[PDB]
Amino acid sequence: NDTSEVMLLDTGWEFSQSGTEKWMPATVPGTVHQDLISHELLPNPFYGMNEKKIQWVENEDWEYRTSFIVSEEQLNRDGIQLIFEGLDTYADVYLNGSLLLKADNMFVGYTLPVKSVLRKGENHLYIYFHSPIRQTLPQYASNGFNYPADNDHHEKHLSVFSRKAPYSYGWDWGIRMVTSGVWRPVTLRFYDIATISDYYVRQLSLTDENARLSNELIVNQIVPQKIPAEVRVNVSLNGTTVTEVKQQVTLQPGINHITLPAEVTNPVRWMPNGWGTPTLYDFSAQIACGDRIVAEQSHRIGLRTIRVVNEKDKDGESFYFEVNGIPMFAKGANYIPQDALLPNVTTERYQTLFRDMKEANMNMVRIWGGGTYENNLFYDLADENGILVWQDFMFACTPYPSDPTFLKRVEAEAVYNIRRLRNHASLAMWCGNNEILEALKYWGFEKKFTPEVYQGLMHGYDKLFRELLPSTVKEFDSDRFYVHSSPYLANWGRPESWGTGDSHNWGVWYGKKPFESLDTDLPRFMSEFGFQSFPEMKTIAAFAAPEDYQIESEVMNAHQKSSIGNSLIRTYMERDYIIPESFEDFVYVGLVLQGQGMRHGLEAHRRNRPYCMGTLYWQLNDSWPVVSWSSIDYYGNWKALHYQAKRAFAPVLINPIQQNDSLSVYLISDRLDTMEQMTLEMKVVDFDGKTLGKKIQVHSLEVPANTSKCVYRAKLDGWLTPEDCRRSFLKLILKDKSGHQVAESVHFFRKTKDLQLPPTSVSYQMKQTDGKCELTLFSSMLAKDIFIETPLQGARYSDNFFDLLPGERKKVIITSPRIKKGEELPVNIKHIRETYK
Ligand SMILES: [Cl-]
Ligand SMILES: [Cl-]
Numbered sequence: 001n002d003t004s005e006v007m008l009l010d011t012g013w014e015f016s017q018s019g020t021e022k023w024m025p026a027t028v029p030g031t032v033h034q035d036l037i038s039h040e041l042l043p044n045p046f047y048g049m050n051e052k053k054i055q056w057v058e059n060e061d062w063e064y065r066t067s068f069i070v071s072e073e074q075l076n077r078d079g080i081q082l083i084f085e086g087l088d089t090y091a092d093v094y095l096n097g098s099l100l101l102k103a104d105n106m107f108v109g110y111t112l113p114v115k116s117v118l119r120k121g122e123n124h125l126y127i128y129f130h131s132p133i134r135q136t137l138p139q140y141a142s143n144g145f146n147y148p149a150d151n152d153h154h155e156k157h158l159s160v161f162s163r164k165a166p167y168s169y170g171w172d173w174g175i176r177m178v179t180s181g182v183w184r185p186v187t188l189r190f191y192d193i194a195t196i197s198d199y200y201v202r203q204l205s206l207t208d209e210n211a212r213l214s215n216e217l218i219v220n221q222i223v224p225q226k227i228p229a230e231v232r233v234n235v236s237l238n239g240t241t242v243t244e245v246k247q248q249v250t251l252q253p254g255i256n257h258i259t260l261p262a263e264v265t266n267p268v269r270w271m272p273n274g275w276g277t278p279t280l281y282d283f284s285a286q287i288a289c290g291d292r293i294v295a296e297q298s299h300r301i302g303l304r305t306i307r308v309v310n311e312k313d314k315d316g317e318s319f320y321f322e323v324n325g326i327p328m329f330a331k332g333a334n335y336i337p338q339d340a341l342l343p344n345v346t347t348e349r350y351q352t353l354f355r356d357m358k359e360a361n362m363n364m365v366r367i368w369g370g371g372t373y374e375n376n377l378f379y380d381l382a383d384e385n386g387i388l389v390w391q392d393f394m395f396a397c398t399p400y401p402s403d404p405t406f407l408k409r410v411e412a413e414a415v416y417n418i419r420r421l422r423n424h425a426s427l428a429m430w431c432g433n434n435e436i437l438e439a440l441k442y443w444g445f446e447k448k449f450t451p452e453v454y455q456g457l458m459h460g461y462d463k464l465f466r467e468l469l470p471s472t473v474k475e476f477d478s479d480r481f482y483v484h485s486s487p488y489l490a491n492w493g494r495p496e497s498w499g500t501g502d503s504h505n506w507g508v509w510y511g512k513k514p515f516e517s518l519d520t521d522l523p524r525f526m527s528e529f530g531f532q533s534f535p536e537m538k539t540i541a542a543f544a545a546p547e548d549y550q551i552e553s554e555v556m557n558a559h560q561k562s563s564i565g566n567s568l569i570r571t572y573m574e575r576d577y578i579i580p581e582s583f584e585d586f587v588y589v590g591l592v593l594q595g596q597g598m599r600h601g602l603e604a605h606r607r608n609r610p611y612c613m614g615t616l617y618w619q620l621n622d623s624w625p626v627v628s629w630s631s632i633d634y635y636g637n638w639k640a641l642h643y644q645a646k647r648a649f650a651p652v653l654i655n656p657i658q659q660n661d662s663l664s665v666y667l668i669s670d671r672l673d674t675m676e677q678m679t680l681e682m683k684v685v686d687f688d689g690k691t692l693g694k695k696i697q698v699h700s701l702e703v704p705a706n707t708s709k710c711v712y713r714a715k716l717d718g719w720l721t722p723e724d725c726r727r728s729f730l731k732l733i734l735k736d737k738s739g740h741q742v743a744e745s746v747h748f749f750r751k752t753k754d755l756q757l758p759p760t761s762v763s764y765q766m767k768q769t770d771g772k773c774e775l776t777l778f779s780s781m782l783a784k785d786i787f788i789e790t791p792l793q794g795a796r797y798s799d800n801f802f803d804l805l806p807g808e809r810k811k812v813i814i815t816s817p818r819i820k821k822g823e824e825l826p827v828n829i830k831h832i833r834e835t836y837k
C-alpha cells in the first residue's frame with residue numbers, strides 16, 4: 001500500500017443527552033436511537049404502537065466524545081488528517097479546544113488537517129449534535145409557508161431545509177426516526193509528504209482492440225518544500241500486471257494535478273448480469289518519493305460503455321440503456337434504505353441483498369432519491385454482480401428551497417458524491433430527483449400557495465435540477481447521463497404522455513386499476529410500478545400480537561404508511577381470489593396476489609420490447625417491519641413477488657398471454673445469441689394430471705437474441721369448453737432441436753377464484769443436515785401457489801410460491817446457518833384450496 005498509518009476511531013465513544021451530564025457507552029459508527037436502545041432507554045421502535053413513543057429523541061440535542069492517544073513519532077509525521085465519512089447532521093466538532101468544523105450535510109465526507117491541534121498523549125474529540133428539528137424551527141418560522149412534503153410526518157415540514165436522508169422524517173413505507181450521530185467511519189491518517197485526494201480513471205475510448213484511459217490524480221502536498229516524485233499507475237487483472245506507466249514530477253506545496261495515460265490492448269469488458277462476467281481490473285496509483293511509497297489509492301475498474309439513449313422517435317421519446325453497444329432491456333427494482341438506522345445495516349446484509357438481486361436475474365437497481373447516496377460497499381457489490389446503478393440525487397416528492405446557502409450545501413454534496421462514485425463500473429446515470437416536477441405540475445400547488453410562492457417554487461426547481469445538478473455532472477462526470485427528474489414527463493393520469501420517456505405508472509395501487517391494465521398501459525421504460533403486501537407471519541409476529549391480527553387493526557394501520565391503506569389489498573384480492581376467513585390465510589393469499597399481479601406487469605413490459613425497454617418495480621426492500629410494496633421483507637424473507645420476479649426476468653421466458661378469450665404465446669429472450677430450430681410444445685392437463693386432447697407442437701422456431709416474438713395464437717372457443725377452462729392448465733415447454741428443455745411455463749385460463757381446485761394433501765419427505773433442509777414434495781392433484789412456511793427468519797429456498805403439478809414431484813432446498821442436524825425444521829405447507837370451504 002503506502003507508508004501512512006490509519007487509526008480507526010471506532011471504540012471508546014460515549015454519548016449524553018445534552019443538559020443531563022450523564023455519559024454512557026456508545027457504538028460508532030452508530031445512531032442516537034441505537035445507543036439508547038442498547039441501554040434500554042427506548043423500546044423496540046418497530047413493535048406495535050411504539051413509533052409514537054420514540055419521537056421525543058428528535059427534540060433533544062446529543063453529545064458524543066472519545067479520547068485517543070497520539071505518540072511522539074506519530075505527532076512527527078508530515079501530515080495528520082481526521083476524516084469523518086458521515087455526520088448526521090448539524091454537528092459541531094471539537095478537538096483539544098479547537099472547533100474544527102460545523103458540519104451541516106449528512107451526505108458529505110469531511111477531511112480535516114489536524115496535525116497542529118493534536119497533542120502528544122491524550123487527545124479529546126467532542127461532537128455536539130444539534131437537533132435537526134430545533135435547528136430548523138427558526139428557519140421554518142422565517143419561511144412564511146410550509147413546503148408540501150407529505151412524506152415528512154410532522155405538522156412542520158422541516159426536512160426540506162436539511163441535507164439529511166429524507167426518509168428519516170417518515171415516508172409512505174417508512175417509520176419516522178429523525179436520528180443523529182456519527183453515521184459513517186471516523187479515521188485519523190498519519191502520513192508523509194502528501195495524500196491522493198482523488199484518483200479518477202477516465203475512459204477516453206473503448207473498442208474490442210483497445211481501451212484508452214486517462215489516470216487523473218489530485219495530490220495534496222502538505223510540506224513546505226518542493227518534492228521530486230514518481231507517479232506510477234499499475235493496471236492488473238487477477239494479481240498479474242497488464243500495463244504499468246510512470247511519470248516524473250516535482251510536487252509543489254498544496255494541490256497538484258497529475259494526469260497519466262494508459263492503454264489496455266484487447267480489453268476484457270465488464271458485462272452486466274446475464275450477459276457474461278463483470279470483469280474488474282485493479283488500477284493502483286502510487287506516489288513514490290525516494291525509496292518510499294508515500295501515498296497509494298486503488299479502484300476496481302470495469303471497461304465497458306454505457307449509453308442512455310433518450311431520443312425523439314415515432315412513438316414519442318425513447319428511454320433505454322445500451323451496454324457495450326447493445327441495447328439492454330432493464331430488469332430490476334427500486335432500492336430504499338435497508339434500515340431506519342443506517343449503521344445497523346451490516347456487510348452481510350448488503351451481500352445478501354445483492355445475492356437476492358443477482359439470483360432474480362436483475363441487471364439494474366435504482367438508488368431512489370429519498371434515501372442516501374449509498375455506502376462504498378453497495379457500489380462495489382453492484383460492480384462485482386453486474387448490476388447497473390441508476391443514482392438519484394437525494395431529493396424526493398417535494399419542491400425544495402433554492403436560496404444561495406442551500407444551493408451551496410447541495411453543490412458540496414454533489415461534488416463529493418460524484419467524485420466518490422464515478423469510478424464504479426456499475427454507475428449508469430444520475431437523476432436530479434424523484435417525482436418533484438410531477439408534484440409541481442399535478443398536485444395543484446397553483447391553488448395551495450400564492451402565485452408569488454408558486455413562481456418561487458418553479459424558479460427554484462430550475463435553479464437546482466436544470467442548472468446546478470446537471471452543471472455539476474457535466475463538470476465531474478461528463479461521460480454519464482443526467483435527467484432532471486423521474487418520471488421526466490409521463491404522468492400516470494395522462495395516457496397521451498406514456499410514449500415519452502420513463503413512467504411511474506401508479507394506475508395499479510394508487511389508481512386502483514386491475515393488473516390487466518399493465519397489458520395496455522405501456523411505457524417506454526417503467527421506472528416505477530407496484531403493489532403492496534403484508535409480509536409473512538413470522539415477520540408480522542415481530543411487530544404485532546395475535547389480538548392485532550385484523551387488516552385494519554390499530555397496529556396493522558400503524559404499519560401501513562401509504563395514502564391508501566390495507567383495505568385496498570382486500571379489494572384487489574376479491575377480484576381474483578376467494579377471501580380467506582383467517583388472518584394467516586389472508587396474509588398468504590396476499591403474498592400470492594402481489595406476486596401474480598406484479599409478474600403480469602413485468603411480463604407485459606418484456607413482451608412489449610422494443611416499445612418498452614425496461615422495468616424497475618417499486619420496491620425491492622424494506623427499512624423496517626411494515627406493509628409495503630417490497631419483494632423482500634425487512635428480515636430478508638423473499639415474498640412471492642421475489643420468486644415471481646426471478647421467473648419473469650429469466651433470460652429466456654415463454655410468455656402465454658390470454659386476452660379477449662384468445663391465447664397468444666410469446667418467446668422472449670435477453671440472450672446475446674440467437675437460438676435456432678426450437679420447438680414449443682404445449683398440452684392441456686387437468687388437475688388430476690390427465691392430458692386433455694393432443695399435444696400441440698410448434699417446430700422450427702428461431703428465438704433471436706434480445707427479442708420478444710409471438711409464435712402461436714389460438715382462440716379458446718372450439719378448443720376448450722368453459723368447464724375445461726376452470727379445471728385444466730396449459731403446460732408449455734421450449735426445447736432445442738435435440739429435445740433439451742430451455743424454458744417452461746404454466747398457464748391458467750381463468751382467475752384463481754373461478755378455478756375448480758380439488759382438495760389435496762401435499763406430502764413431503766425431508767432430509768435435514770447442518771445448514772440445510774432438503775424437501776421432496778408430492779401431490780397427485782394440482783396444489784395451487786404453494787407456500788412452504790418455516791418459522792426460521794431469513795431462511796432461503798431454492799423455490800417457493802409455485803404450483804405443484806399433479807403427480808410431478810418437486811425438490812426444494814431450504815438453507816440457513818441456523819438449521820441444525822437432528823433439530824427438525826418446522827414446515828407448514830399452504831396452498832390456495834386449503835384457504836376456503
Ligand atoms: Cl496536517
Ligand atoms: Cl416547510
Ligand SMILES: [Cl-]
Nearest residue numbers: 255256257258
Ligand atoms: Cl499542478
